[PDB]
């Protein structure tokens, strides 16, 4: 049970002159806002949208800024957490929603944590898939926290505007088939991306279709990314200094709203152990864990994702 | 408080391959679907949208089929009540709404009574402004009812395709300034429209702005009706026999859901006494009545409309 795009309600909200945000909407009850990661789409929530609606929730599945039918301004600073969060609050204002539950994955995970810290009054409850909440280290540069973790090398590859874009936009069909794979089907090492050409140099030219996706599902993502490309999406990675600067102003404060951290056993970039000290900042934090599950959590173990989210939603 | 269109959430639902219904959405809580009349817009609910939203309701204010950003197919049969009603059901299905409160005015009022009649399981409660529910008379065509009451003479003028269009479309600013007036500011001859040749042909060339509206608000309607003209809206009147035959299939069943009839003292076409026997067919009918109020109820007496609807909503 997934979604057909033309059978959904499509919403559009202008949060500022140059910027409209597009979303899909299904169900009635408390408002649940779903925020995808990189490089995805509202469509990445196709298994959760109908399930949460049927569980008695009003689901808003976003195209995040830079993606799909949402605006994709070229300026890098338009995608820093501060600016993205304010727009999400403007979004709630224009829909007349005093609060929403926020659920995010990957970069969307990151964003909802930030909403929880800087806009707790507008966030009823907060849930993240894969993305942990790591307090800002005011002494360690952000750039530094990477050259200290080997699997984050691709993030440096993403910094130079035009470089990752041109490789990722080269064959869009190849890009998504290469990325959207189970952990055991993976054909990418995140180790040595900068020195050894790009992200796909040593991976196949005509990669096979993963067990998780159909050819029709891949083509939806292709069509979405034809309209703005990867620049906007990648600009999410190009604000680490600003995001760190901004995060440090919150250094003392605590998330007191209900919170859920869901970890994927086989996400080799957003590892479960990265989240291990989160109760030290959120004592009441609930958890879920999903075995045999990679980075693309919603796609990989949709049934477990739905069970975990619904159980948490119905209780806190 | 009114509305500024670019400050609103805009939603779009495809109900049939080439039919797309546009709506504005504001607020959280039980779903309230507002259906305007002829020749209006979602915008006609500008005073109710924020009031109802602030009172704890999720307001969906529609552009009805043929209007604004909704599809306006040219075929007459597309605007018979049976088809419009089924499309509103499909609208709820794609939004994932099991029920909604339907509130309509004028033609939208007629649509909501039929929603209540034929789809009571999808209608939480029903309210109508001005438009009464009169059960079909199986021994009297709709042409014979219009002859008896000569205040519906304009409806005959509306039947021949192209004729009423040419006059209403000639000068849009004039059309809306002449129509949107308080009862005491009326310049319209409703009695002899076919004899005169035109609806406005005896009224001013450069009419004044009614105390009810600003020039800005009139210009909003002008921009809207440039998109599709009057053929779609006027097609609402061109299905009397189709509507009659369909309403006869209800076989004198009753409306058992909570219902509200709001009458307007000075509407000289949808007269208050036209509603007088409705409690026979509608056991649980509550009533409101607005004094000094003409046909354009929502603009004329927004504060009184709001208090009546909000009180009824909170109790029923």
Author numbering:
A (entry chain A), B (entry chain B): 230 to 545
Sentences from the paper on this structure:
Human soluble epoxide hydrolase (hsEH) is a cytosolic enzyme which modulates the metabolism of bioactive epoxy fatty acids (EpFAs), by converting them into their corresponding vicinal diols. Whilst the N-terminal domain exerts phosphatase activity on glycerophospoholipids and lysophosphatidic acids, the hydrolytic activity on EpFAs resides in the C-terminal domain (CTD).
First, we solved the structure of apo hsEH CTD by X-ray crystallography, and our results were found to be in excellent agreement with previously deposited structures of the full-length enzyme, with an RMSD of 0.257 Å on all CTD heavy atoms. Superposition of the apo and holo crystal structures gave an RMSD on all heavy atoms of 0.198 Å, indicating a high similarity of the two structures. Minor changes were observed in two regions proximal to the F267 Pocket.
